Amino acid sequence: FGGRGLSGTGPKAGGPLYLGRLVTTAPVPPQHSSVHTDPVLLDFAKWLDGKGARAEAEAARNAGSSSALGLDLELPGPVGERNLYTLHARGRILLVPATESGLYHQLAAALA
């Protein structure tokens, strides 16, 4: 339970991301993964590689893999009901970088 916009910050109560917010290093929640890779992230990583920013291109690819964007799960519940849980893009992320590499890392995270 929990919404977006004026309805709150997330993560959802009674959901698998909740405890991760209450620790300084978040764990990987159960079933939290996705085989989808954001295609713009991929385009960004190739651009970084063509630019010689090999550390950032590597970081971008790793972000694309570890992102759980596109997760699409059915949760156990009662008969006669289908309860679905999905991870989507949040929207537009404000990036406040200080350095070029910081910007590449933030952009990779947001694009992924």
Q: How far is the CB of 95 from its own copies (least distance, A)?
A: 19
Does the protein bind its own copies through residue 106 (CB under 8 A)?
Answer: no
Indicate left, alpha or beta for 91 from its phi (over 0: left) and psi (-120 to 50: alpha).
left
Name the one range near its own copies by CB under 8 A: 35-43, 81-89, 92-100, 101-109. 35-43
CA-based end-to-end distance of the chain: 24
How far apart CA 63 and CA 45 sit, in angstroms, is 10
DSSP state of 26: -
78 binds its own copies (CB under 8 A): no
One-letter amino acid of 61: R
112 exposed, middle or buried (CB, 10 Å; 0-12, 13-18, 19+)? buried
Report if residue 89 touches its own copies, rule: CB under 8 A. no
Rule CB under 8 A: say whether 25 interacts with its own copies: yes
Chain residues 52-71 in contact with its own copies, contact rule CB under 8 A: 57-58, 61, 65-66, 68
Q: Which residues bind its own copies (CB under 8 A)?
A: 13-14, 16, 18-20, 22-37, 39, 42, 45-46, 49, 57-58, 61, 65-66, 68
